[PDB]
Amino acid sequence: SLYDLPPYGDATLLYFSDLHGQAFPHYFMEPPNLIAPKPLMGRPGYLTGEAILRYYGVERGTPLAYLLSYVDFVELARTFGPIGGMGALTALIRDQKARVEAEGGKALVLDGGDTWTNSGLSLLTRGEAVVRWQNLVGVDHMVSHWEWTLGRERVEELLGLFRGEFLSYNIVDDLFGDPLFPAYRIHRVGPYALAVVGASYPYVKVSHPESFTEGLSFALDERRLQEAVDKARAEGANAVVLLSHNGMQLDAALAERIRGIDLILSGHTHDLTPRPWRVGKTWIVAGSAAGKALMRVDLKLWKGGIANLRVRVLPVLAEHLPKAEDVEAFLKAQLAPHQDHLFTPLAVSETLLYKRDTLYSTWDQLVGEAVKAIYPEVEVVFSPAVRWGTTILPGQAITWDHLYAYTGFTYPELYLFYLRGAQIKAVLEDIASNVFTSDPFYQQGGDVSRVFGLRYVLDPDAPTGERVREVEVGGRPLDPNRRYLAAAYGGRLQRVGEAKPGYEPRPIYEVLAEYLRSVGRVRVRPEPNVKVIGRNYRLPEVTG
Ligand SMILES: [Mn+2]
Ligand SMILES: [Mn+2]
């Protein structure tokens, strides 16, 4: 029994992160690849497939293996059923908190951020229905990242509804530098005091439209973070927990630079850590994503920190959890009007459609194919390599709710523009230098944009300017001076391009629904357009 655990410690943290508004049970496969430059290979955040199972001592075919790796995915999805769903997550959280309290324990419900956005329910209520669900379950704290794509005003509004206490040491006014929210909160846990410090994603300005966060700075400030930890302890905190949305590698670097952080609950990177990652004098536990798991962290505290801890990744399996009737009732009420829109099949996929990967996915290829089919003049389609999304099983129907799960940006516009061949290589080399940075302190936690219509060779360990080679567009060598017509959504690439005259940008999801409804069935087979030097590029089994 995964959920039946004996008591342990003075305090229990019930933690999830990066739900990305996923209201319903769904499928979410881990990436087939998490390519690292040599210096970073074999670390948590860079483990996939069989390697991840071995690292954590997880047996193949188990519920944990199903959550942790792409290995046997389709087979395990049919065996254990879908993951997540606000209903099941709520039921699990409620079960766990009741056990702990009945033990005489103290349980905190911590949300790592990236909760309010990127789903049908979210887009339909501009995030509000997600905030309401949060209040139903009882979230004690949360940090943020994508929340800000709602715009400063809407966030300000929703925080008025949010019953938990929002934290962040780094969101400050861009002129005066005064923090807008509390950096941390101290909770009494028996005779001890536990401080929960919050950190929001520091790269919000360059990752989303600048207008969403005008007047704010989210910059990483070690001096300021260190000072908040020092203050928490001065005020009585025995132990310090960082509820983070920096990204796990950045969290790791901080563990070696900041003093006094005992545990980091790492969001943003969508990682899974069945056993805590020990860095310096800190333990790190990742928050997974899309509601697939509830991390239960039991702490035995001492006057100077965390003496020991028990970490359990609890799978959120809807077929094996009781119902949270109030959550189910609330969702039916919230989405009754939109049932037909959200859940009517648009098309049936014959193969596995997955999103997560360093370089390539079948979902993103489907999108490239959809764009080219509707805009035949397009030569290259740049798809955003976000880590949020969903997974479609073979024979499963694709719905609007799925489209919003995959492309539910608040700025979902597809842009058509010309790029010179030299800009194409430069863009890839640029992304490559960010993703394959050998220094974790500079890591931003993203993947490489998928470019449909081109093929290339990548050397993660080559010097900057030399990582991308042998570029080919439409079966011919890349010509640096030729103007290629490109398409791109969810990013900023259009800013350096020459807009296609006569084209009016429109939401990527409209283009996809139009395509899907027409073809009725899709069968995208994995055909990676990249060759990785020094690495074995892996693929999942897409049938079954
Ligand atoms: Mn996220
Ligand atoms: Mn994030």
Separation of alpha carbons 4 and 500, rounded Å: 59
Ranges of beta strands (E only) in 267-412 are 277-279, 282-286, 293-302, 305-315, 345-349, 380-383, 396-399
CB distance 305 to 340 below 8 Å: no
Helices (H), 236-394: 248-255, 325-335, 339-343, 362-374
Give the containing element (helix H, strand E) for 230.
helix 222-234
Q: Which ligand is nearest to the CA of 246?
A: 2
Q: Strand pairing of 468-473 and 454-458?
A: antiparallel
Is 114 assigned a ligand-binding role in the annotation? yes
Structure tokens that stand for 416 in this block: 């058509």
Q: What 3-state class would DSSP assign to 227?
A: helix
CB 238 within 8 A of CB 301: yes
3-state secondary structure 48-107: CHHHHHHHHCCCCCCHHHHHHCCCCHHHHHHHHCCECCHHHHHHHHHHHHHHHHHCCCEE
Q: What ranges do the domains of the chain cover?
A: 1-27+81-344, 28-80, 345-544
- For residue 301, list its beta bridge partners: 306
Q: Minimal CA–CA distance to 199: which of 256, 131, 245, 260? A: 245
For the 345-544 domain, the top CATH level (class) is: alpha beta
How far apart, in Å, are the Cα atoms of 37 and each of 145, 254, 435, 440, 460? 26, 20, 9, 11, 5
Which ligand does the CA of 244 lie closest to? 2
Q: Are strands 277-279 and 282-286 parallel, antiparallel or unpaired?
A: antiparallel
Q: How many Å apart are CA 539 and CA 544, to the nearest integer?
A: 15
Describe the crossing of helices 325-335 and 86-102 by its angle, rounded to 10 degrees.
Answer: 150
285 CA from centroid of ligand 2 (Å): 16
Helix crossing, 400-407 with 508-519: angle to 10°?
140
> Could you tell me the distance, in angstroms and rounded to a whole number, from the CA of residue 473 to the centre of ligand 2?
32
Q: For residues 407 and 492, what is the distance between their CA atoms, to the nearest angstrom?
A: 15
* Three-state secondary structure string covering 108-148: EEEECCCCCCCCHHHHHCCCHHHHHHHHHHCCCEECCCHHH
10 known ligand binder: no
For residue 287, the ligand closest to its alpha carbon is 1
Q: Alpha-carbon distance 3 to 96, whole Å?
A: 8
Fold classification of 28-80 (topology level): Helix Hairpins (6.10.140)
Give the C-alpha distances (Å, rounded to integers) separating 91 from 121, 287, 443. 19, 18, 35
Distance CA 384, CA 381 (A): 10
18 is in an annotated binding site: yes
The answer to whether the beta carbons of residues 136 and 327 sit under 8 Å apart is yes
From the number of C-beta atoms within 10 Å of its C-beta (0-12, 13-18, 19+), residue 474 rates as exposed
Annotate 480-540 with three-state secondary structure: CCCEEEEEEECCCHHHHCEECCCCCCEEHHHHHHHHHHHHCEECCCCCCCEEECCCCCCCC
Beta bridge partners of 521: 348
CB 112 within 8 A of CB 15: yes
Identify any residues that bridge with 487 across adjacent strands, giving them in sequence order. 381, 416
CA nearest neighbour of 540 among 521, 520, 522, 525: 525
Does 268 count as an annotated binding residue? yes
| Ligand 2 geometric centre to CA of 147 (Å) | 9
Query: Running DSSP on this structure, what letter comes out for residue 286?
Result: E
49 contacts 538 by C-beta, under 8 angstroms: yes
Sign of the CA dihedral running 496, 501, 505, 506: negative
CB neighbourhood size of 42 (10 A): 10
Ligand minimally distant from the alpha carbon of residue 388: 1
Question: Which ligand sits nearest to residue 202's alpha carbon?
Answer: 2
Q: Which residues contact 254 (CB under 8 A, 6 or more apart)?
A: 222, 225, 242, 246, 261, 264
Q: 201 alpha carbon to ligand 2 midpoint, in Å?
A: 7
Which residues have a Cβ under 8 Å from the Cβ of 356 and sit 6 or more positions away?
A: 29, 30, 31, 270, 387, 389, 447
Q: Ligand 2 centroid vs 66 CA: distance in angstroms?
A: 23
Method: X-ray
User: In whole angstroms, what is the distance from residue 227 CA to residue 225 CA?
Assistant: 5
Cα–Cα distance for residue pair 60/8, rounded to 1 Å:
27
Q: Which two structure tokens, joined as six digits, stand for 406?
A: 């995959």
Distance from the CA of 337 to the center of ligand 2, in angstroms?
30
Which structure tokens are listed for 54? Answer: 């071995």
Tokens, residue 186: 């101290």
d(CA 488, CA 207): 15
CATH architecture of 1-27+81-344: 4-Layer Sandwich (3.60)
Centroid of ligand 2 to alpha carbon of 121 (angstroms): 19
**What is d(CA 489, CA 516) in angstroms, rounded to the nearest whole number?**
18
From residue 45, alpha-carbon distances to 110, 136, 263, 290, 510 in Å are 21, 32, 17, 17, 34
Angle between helices 128-137 and 325-335 (to 10 degrees): 170
Is 357 annotated as contributing to ligand binding? no
Whether 189 and 11 have beta carbons less than 8 Å apart is answered as: yes
Nearest ligand, measured from the Cα of 200 = 2
Which residues line ion ligand 1, judged by CB < 5 Å? Answer: 18, 114
341 is annotated as contributing to ligand binding: no
According to DSSP, residue 393 is labeled: P
Q: What pairing do the DSSP bridges indicate for beta strands 498-499 and 165-166?
A: unpaired
Of the bound ligands, which one is closest to the alpha carbon of residue 143?
A: 2
- Asked if 487 contacts 416 with a C-beta cutoff of 8 angstroms, the reply is yes
Is 20 annotated as ligand-binding?
yes
CA distance 434 to 246: 15
Nearby residues for ligand 2 (ion, Cβ within 5 Å): 114, 145, 268
Handedness of CA 407, 73, 399, 334 (dihedral sign): negative
Cα 248 from Cα 441, distance rounded (Å): 10
Classified as helix, coil or strand, 219 is: coil
